[PDB]
Design a binder for this molecule. Structure first.
Ligand SMILES: [Cl-]
Ligand SMILES: [Cl-]
Ligand SMILES: [Cl-]
Ligand SMILES: [Cl-]
Ligand SMILES: [Cl-]
Ligand SMILES: [Cl-]
Ligand SMILES: [Cl-]
Ligand SMILES: [Mg+2]
Ligand SMILES: [Mg+2]
Ligand SMILES: [Mg+2]
Length: 240
């Protein structure tokens, strides 16, 4: 039987590492324009939640422009559900210049892991913490096929393996497929039975889509259906 995991919020607590990278990146560009007002944490969360931004480089861009305008709070509220960076760019008439934001974001998130760093910085990725106990993955790998489907890139997945202390040979990353596309799960399991362990509704939808297209597969949501992935793995080992 397959046990397939999400990474963020299931195996790894990304202790708001991405959120602080978004904040620091925006505040870096704000500082260039002599704006010292801080980016509020709820703005990052809410804008990402309601938006359909392509990535946190785009979320950072939106926050920079909004905070430059002095009405970020109002603009977060006004921004349409399902909006993208285009709404912001059309509104203010300005956009990011080349990879300016991406280079700064990656400097803050990756630090020395980023070969094109703009300055030396201790990567925010290292504030992420394992939720899963490696001993359980080791124990489970003897009796179940293990895999991951993650929005992480291959490089970010190597980082996750460092944080966890376990290597995943069967992994789907964003180079290949993106949840909630059910082909991501088919890629791994090819119709064999199993379960996917997620932390969000998008994970639930992913598996609903798989059931719609391919066939049966279970879904468990950490913090609703089970306390965490470790209790899940212990129940699986102790009783099927
Ligand atoms: Cl998390
Ligand atoms: Cl976007
Ligand atoms: Cl503001
Ligand atoms: Cl655009
Ligand atoms: Cl470092
Ligand atoms: Cl153990
Ligand atoms: Cl994900
Ligand atoms: Mg997740
Ligand atoms: Mg947390
Ligand atoms: Mg309980």
């Amino acid at each position: 039987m397959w046990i397939v995991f999400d990474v963020d919020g299931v195996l790894i607590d990304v202790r708001e590492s991405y959120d602080e990278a978004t904040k620091l990146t925006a505040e870096y560009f704000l500082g260039l324009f002599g704006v010292e007002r801080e980016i509020k944490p709820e703005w990052v969360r809410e804008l990402r939640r309601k938006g359909s931004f392509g990535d946190d480089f785009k979320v950072s861009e939106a926050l920079i422009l909004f905070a430059l305008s002095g009405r970020a709070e109002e603009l977060v509220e006004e921004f349409p559900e399902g909006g993208t960076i285009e709404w912001v760019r059309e509104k203010f008439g300005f956009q990011v210049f080349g990879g300016s934001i991406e280079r700064v974001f990656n400097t803050f998130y990756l630090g020395r892991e980023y070969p094109e760093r703009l300055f030396d910085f201790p990567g925010l990725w290292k504030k992420e913490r394992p939720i899963v106990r490696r001993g359980l993955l080791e124990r489970a790998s003897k009796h179940f096929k293990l895999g991951v489907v993650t929005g992480r890139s291959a490089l970010e997945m190597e980082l996750a393996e460092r944080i966890i202390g376990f290597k995943f040979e069967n992994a789907v990353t964003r180079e290949a497929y993106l949840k909630p596309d059910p082909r991501a799960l088919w890629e791994l399991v090819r119709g064999e039975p199993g379960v996917y362990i997620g932390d969000t509704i998008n994970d639930e939808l992913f598996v609903e889509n798989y059931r719609g297209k391919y066939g049966d597969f279970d879904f468990v949501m950490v913090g609703r259906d089970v306390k965490d992935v470790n209790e899940f793995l212990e129940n699986a080992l102790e009783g099927g």
